[PDB]
Structure formats: structure tokens, C-alpha cells
Write a protein that binds this DNA or RNA. Structure first.
Ligand SMILES: [Mn+2]
Ligand SMILES: [Mn+2]
Ligand SMILES: [Mn+2]
Ligand SMILES: [Mn+2]
Lengths: 437, 435
RNA sequence: AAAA
């Protein structure tokens, strides 16, 4: 009969409320979720959907009371809505976490409840979740509890509370290309890994740009039709000794030939130390079978795999569980909305770390990739998420990009980190260091 | 000495504090800027730079009182700092605008001042980001600052720590010099075609055959050797040569655009593609085609969109160079520069506009991320980003919902326009920005 | 300016 209620303020960032609720739900009998109603005339959207997700993923059920506020920018209206809608039952403890919502919502909800329950029969408590030091702080009470390593969340819950659905991703055991280059993926992977370990990445990248991309990536679907491909080849042969084809046949490094010859016999782009040039007979379907997957993987997907493989090891040493706290090829969508793609995701406690990968050394493209990773992690994991971009650029460029796209939030730790070509061989350690600090 | 003090909480968004400060400045004798100190051990950065920029651009002089907080997440540390550092003079009114700062800063600065001062007039206010209203707690007023408070691009970028601001006016646009005496005729001819719903046909012709002919090796159009070899390669592919498509399948309205350039700047020799002779030096080739190609390759679209809104912004009494402009560039200290095609300021909301003739989903999406982040960096968290592309209507609606981020407003802060909007892009922007 |  001594009811204890926890009050949470539902803003546009559902994560903090989830963390606080997960930590305190066991000690409370009722939960009041104060949220915003929708009034387009005042440019105010509703946070009800967030409140619903919070109730669902925290299993509040019938203990949850939803309190709607008409205007979250007006004190008068907030106070009035409170006196009219706030639960009237007799409580012995009212706990308010005022981390979320508008500043006016926080001030007037706090003072309203402090007065309504000033009776010493009722204990009033105020809490705040600090995003900078991952701790729950109580008002007037030195008691400070770090929730950084105590509250955990899985990828599905994180995306769900942020209104994302149809979440799909891959495991190391379920990598798509492992099925496409069956019986050969492992050799292909090791050959590439050995090269990266031998500081050969920059050479591989340069070769991929020229002569590889000039040959296999010059048109929209040249590798889909034998005709166009043979034409592209014929055209290139006109440039003679400067042709990309000659460069491929005469100046391709041995380590690259080793990687190329690690592919299955029916999926190789070369016939000996020569480019395989389809004859007139080759069927368009035959061509695609032999070159599509191979070219796509070599055009970059390999880097994603390599970095993932380097990180899995270290993350297993830690408590992270694949599928829940880390994965590759993440895709999801908001209802009736276009899907997104994130190469690698990692969750440290309740912080999302998104990793985008590019083999590019060019400043312009890498810059754009940075904007992308920053926006995506914010959309799917919240405003306190970290974004990491792994590029094929040198240190000076990486440092410049970090300064270029840096945005201030009040924290001393960076939320946008850029790695470069010199970090590839030891990328796993570099990631472990940046993520787990 | 009936002194009246205004208290502001300095978060990482200085714009609302500047707006509230500019509105209430002439009513208060003292200003207490409460900001955070830096402490790496608690991952707490300092907002002192924003407080400095607020004092500078509000011209507070010695009437500004800096009040540092050591820990903006600790209620006891906040109260102790306030009790020891808040000015002790006799005030008849203490006005606290609690719009900025962390929630703990807001709660405990509000209750500390409400206890300390409230038969003395205590007042709390909050600037609504959604409806542009300064709401009072005790007087229960709600004054709209949407059309009252104005800010220029220099002040806006400076409070957000950006410096070395440069841009171009309508009458200082660069290409006007590249085509002296002829820029008008060139832009009017292009404008006439886009207003005639020829934009989609124009961009198709720019992708092929225009970019096949003039967009190859770096400096291709500045080296006769590179360019003549290139054309000779193209002529080899006679059946589908872009040179044949240029001469035989170019529509009439594009010939009128090409013929609008001066004689020494035309890509065409009569009704054919101009192929340079062997007497043509590197200087001759570059003088004829370099500026014409770069302008037709996309730069023309920046000028077109800018010219379609200039008259509509002057009708609304906005001042060029202060509230709108082209080719904005700036930077942070010792930091790389940024480039924004067009900027517009409605009241005190920044509207950044990124332009591209591209119809590709992937490239337009990357430009969407860029303009979203840039207007956030230089204009704050409540700025609007507009991306004008060449995609069809269905691709713009997808990209709009693709990059939409929920901040609590019903009005979208990321707007995407496409090829269907070019003919009336002036009205499409005016309605989106002001209505 | 709805985990500064
Ligand atoms: Mn009243
Ligand atoms: Mn599914
Ligand atoms: Mn990638
Ligand atoms: Mn542009």
C-alpha cells in the first residue's frame, strides 16, 4: 500500500530514460511517463511513440501512466496539465529523473511535484543522468552511481526505442561473401590480411584505383553484359602501353596476383598473368557469375571484413556478445521509410559506436563519409553516440578531417574519430583503445 | 542604485542566449553569464568561449559578470559555486533565462535564485525554439521574437566560433568576370530554358554527351595534347560517339544556350563541336573552353537559384551580405574551411542551401549529410538545411525521410527539392523558408 | 534552445 512512483520526462532522446528505468524499475511500483502532445500550429511534435517504446522495452505494463502535456514550452500550460492529469493517489516516495525534455518541462515538473509532495510523509528525490561521466546523480545527495558498465543494451532494443525496425545484420559465421566464394573465402581473407599486416594496404588501394577500377568499374553495368565489357576492354587497348590492361598484366604486384589467384577457379578475373578477356561466346550470365562477386568484394567489401575480423577477437576477450553488442552490415528502417546501411556497429555498455569504412585516400569523399556516419549514429543511437571513420588517408589528412567535422556537445572526449592507412595493420587495437576508455 | 540583473546559462548553443540578450539588454544593468569550466577527468568541456563571444557581440562591457561552474552535473557543486560567486549587490529585479545549460544547471540555478531573491522581483523566462516565443514564468507573457530580433551572418558564425567569413554579392559574383559583357546574356538564356521546364532535358545532355567530351583527364581542357587525343579516342567509337550525339542530337534550346557565350568562349564551331587545330596552343584551348565548361558543368545552377530568390528576399527587406549571400566560406581556428553554396537568415534561423544538378541517389544523399552538419556547426541546433538536387520527385521524398532527424518540431529542418522544382525554385524556397 |  506504500506506493512508490518513478517519474520520467520523455524527450526526443529515449536512451537516457531507458538506462535510468532499467536501473531503478525494481524499486518502484508505478511509473509516470510525461510526454508531449502534437500541435503542428505551435511546431510541436509528440514524444508519445518514445514513451510507448520505453514502456514496452522496460516491461512497465499496467504500472505505467502516460501523462500528456499540451505545450512543453509554456509553464502555465505545463503546470495546469500537471494538476489536472498527474496521478492523484497517495505515494510514499516520488522520484523524478529530470534528464529528458525541455528545460521548462524540467523546472516546472520538478517544482510542481516537490510542492505536491512536500509532506514529510512523502520522500521527494531528484535524479539526473550525466552523459559525460555515465553516472546517475541524486539531488543534494553525494551518492553518484556509475551506470556505464552496469546497464547494458542490445542493438535491437537501441534501434527499437529510436523507432527503427526490420533490423538486420551479419555475423562472422554468416558473412554473405563466405557463401559466394565458398571453399575459398578463408584463403582469400588470409591473403588480404597478410598484405595489410605487411603494410601493403596503400599499394593495394592504389592498384585498385588504377588499374582495377579503370577496368571493372567504368560503366553502370558493364560487368553485367559481355558486350559492353568487351567494348570497354577494346577501348582501353587503344591507349596502348599506357592502357590499364597493360598495367594490370605487367605491373601488378605479386601479392596482388596471390590475392587474385586465391579466388575460386570460376570466379577469377585473370587467366594466368593476364586479364581474362571474355570471348564472343561468353554469356552475360556466365560473365556475372565469374566477375560480379569478385569485383564487388575487391572494390572494398574486403576492408569491412578485415576490420571486423580484427575487432571480433578483441571484443571476445571482453564480455561483448556478437549479434547483440557488435556486428557487420547493419540495416534497418523507420516505418515506411528508406533503409540505412552501417558497416560495423559496436555497443559499449549503452553507447553506440558506429564504424564506417572507406579505402579512399581522397579528402572529399572521406569528408562526406564522415558526415554520413555522424548523422546515422545520432539517428539510431542518440545524441551521445560515437562515430568512427576508417579511411585510407595519411595522418595529417585524418587529423584535418576530425577538426573539420568536429561538433561541440560539452564533452572533452571526441565523438567523431578518424583513422587512417597507418592504423590498418593494428586496427583492432586502435579500435579497442578508442572505444574502451 | 536600483540595479536589475539578467542571468543567462551558457550552454553549447549560444544563439538563444544571444537572442534573449539582444531583446532584454536595454532593461538590465548587470549580466551574469553562468558557464562551465573544463575538467577532463569528468569529460566536461568548457563553454567559456561562448560566454566570451556573448559578452563581445552583446557589447556588455564591464556590466558582464562571468560565473564559472566546476561541475555542471553535481547539484552540490553548482549550489556551492553559486553561493560563493553570484554577485552580492542589492538588486531590485533578478531575471533568469534558463534556456541553456544542462538540466542540473537549470534546476539548481533556478531554485537557488528563487530562494535568494523572490519581496524582490524574481522572474524566469525560456525561449521556445519551436514557435520563437520568449515565455515568462511569473508575468505569464509570451512575446514572439521571430520578427523582432535580427542577426547577420558575421555575428551568427562568430558566436559559433567561426572566423574569416567571406562570400560574394550579386554584383560581385565571380563568373561575371569570367564572362565580361556576356554573363547577362548567358544567364538569361539559361534562365529562360529552366523556366520552360527544360531542366530535366538539360541535365541529361550534360551527363551525355557533354561530360563524355569535356570531362576526362585532369587538365584535359588545358592541354591540347590531352584533349586532341581524347577526342580522337571518342571518334574511334563512331557508332555511339558522343561527338556524333553532340552534333546531331543536341536540342534547339541547348544550341541557344551555347550560342549565348561570346565567340572566343563557345564550345561549338557553328552547329558542330569545336575541335582545336594543331596551331591551337595550351593557352588558346584553356581561354576558349575552361571557364565555359566549368560554368555549364554546374556552377550555372548556383547562380540561377540565387537569382530566383534575390528579388523575393529584398521585398522582405532582407539585406544582402548580412542576411543572405552566395559562396559562403569560413573556418574555425587553425581548422579546415567549409563551403556553403547559399545562405539565408530568416529572423535568427539560419537556412543553408546546398545545390547540385546530380540525379544520382548516392551522391545527393552524401550532399544531404553535408549540409545538415554544416548548418548545425555554424548556425546551431535549430538551423534549417535545404538540398536542391536534380532527382525526380520520388527520389527527393525518399531522401527527405531518409535523413530526417527527430528534434521535437513538426516543421522539417531538412528539405530536399528536385528537378520538378527548378522552374519555380524561387517560390518553392520562399514558401518553405518564410511560411 | 526536448542526456548542455
Ligand atoms: Mn493563469
Ligand atoms: Mn526482417
Ligand atoms: Mn563503407
Ligand atoms: Mn554545390
Amino acid at each position: 500500500m506504500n506506493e512508490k512512483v518513478l517519474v520520467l520526462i520523455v524527450g526526443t532522446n529515449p536512451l537516457p530514460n531507458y538506462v535510468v528505468g532499467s536501473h531503478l524499475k525494481e524499486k518502484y511500483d508505478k511509473f509516470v511517463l510525461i510526454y508531449s502532445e502534437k500541435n503542428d500550429k505551435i511546431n510541436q511534435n509528440s514524444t508519445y511513440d518514445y514513451a510507448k517504446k520505453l514502456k514496452e522495452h522496460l516491461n512497465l505494463n499496467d504500472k505505467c501512466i502516460f501523462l500528456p502535456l499540451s505545450d512543453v514550452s509554456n509553464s502555465e500550460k505545463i503546470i495546469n496539465d500537471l494538476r489536472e492529469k498527474f496521478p492523484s493517489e497517495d505515494f510514499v516516495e516520488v522520484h523524478l529523473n529530470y534528464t529528458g525534455g525541455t528545460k521548462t518541462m524540467v523546472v516546472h515538473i520538478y517544482n510542481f511535484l516537490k510542492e505536491k509532495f512536500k509532506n514529510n510523509k512523502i520522500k521527494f528525490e531528484g535524479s539526473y543522468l550525466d552523459a559525460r561521466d555515465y553516472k546517475l546523480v541524486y539531488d543534494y545527495s553525494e551518492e553518484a552511481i556509475s551506470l556505464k558498465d552496469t546497464i547494458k543494451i542490445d542493438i535491437n532494443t537501441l534501434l527499437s526505442i529510436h523507432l527503427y525496425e526490420d533490423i538486420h545484420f551479419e555475423f562472422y559465421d554468416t558473412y554473405s561473401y563466405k557463401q559466394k566464394f565458398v571453399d575459398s573465402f578463408d584463403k582469400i581473407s588470409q591473403e588480404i590480411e597478410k598484405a595489410i599486416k605487411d603494410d601493403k594496404g596503400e599499394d593495394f588501394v592504389k592498384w585498385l584505383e588504377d588499374p582495377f577500377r579503370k577496368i571493372f568499374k567504368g560503366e553502370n553495368k558493364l560487368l553485367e553484359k559481355t558486350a559492353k565489357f568487351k567494348k570497354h576492354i577494346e577501348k582501353l587497348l587503344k591507349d596502348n602501353d599506357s592502357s590499364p590492361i597493360v598495367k594490370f598484366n605487367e605491373k601488378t604486384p605479386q601479392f596482388i596476383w596471390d590475392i587474385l589467384n586465391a579466388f575460386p577457379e570460376g570466379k577469377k578475373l585473370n587467366d594466368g598473368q593476364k586479364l581474362w578477356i571474355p570471348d564472343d561466346k561468353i554469356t552475360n550470365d556466365n560473365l556475372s557469375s565469374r566477375v560480379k562477386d569478385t569485383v564487388e568484394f575487391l572494390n572494398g567489401k574486403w576492408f569491412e571484413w578485415y576490420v571486423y575480423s580484427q575487432i571480433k577477437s578483441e571484443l571476445l576477450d571482453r564480455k561483448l556478445k556478437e549479434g547483440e553488442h557488435f556486428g557487420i552490415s547493419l540495416k534497418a528502417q523507420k516505418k515506411d521509410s528508406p533503409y540505412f546501411e552501417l558497416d560495423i556497429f559496436l555497443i559499449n555498455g549503452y553507447q553506440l559506436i558506429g564504424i564506417s569504412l572507406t579505402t579512399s585516400s581522397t579528402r572529399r569523399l572521406c569528408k562526406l563519409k564522415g558526415f554520413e556516419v555522424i548523422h546515422r549514429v545520432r539517428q539510431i543511437g542518440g545524441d551521445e553516440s560515437k562515430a568512427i571513420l576508417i579511411t585510407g588517408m595519411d595522418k595529417s589528412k585524418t587529423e584535418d578531417l576530425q577538426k573539420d567535422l568536429a561538433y561541440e556537445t560539452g564533452s572533452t572526449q571526441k565523438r567523431f574519430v578518424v583513422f587512417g592507412i597507418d592504423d590498418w595493420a593494428d586496427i583492432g587495437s586502435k579500435i579497442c583503445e578508442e572505444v574502451f576508455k
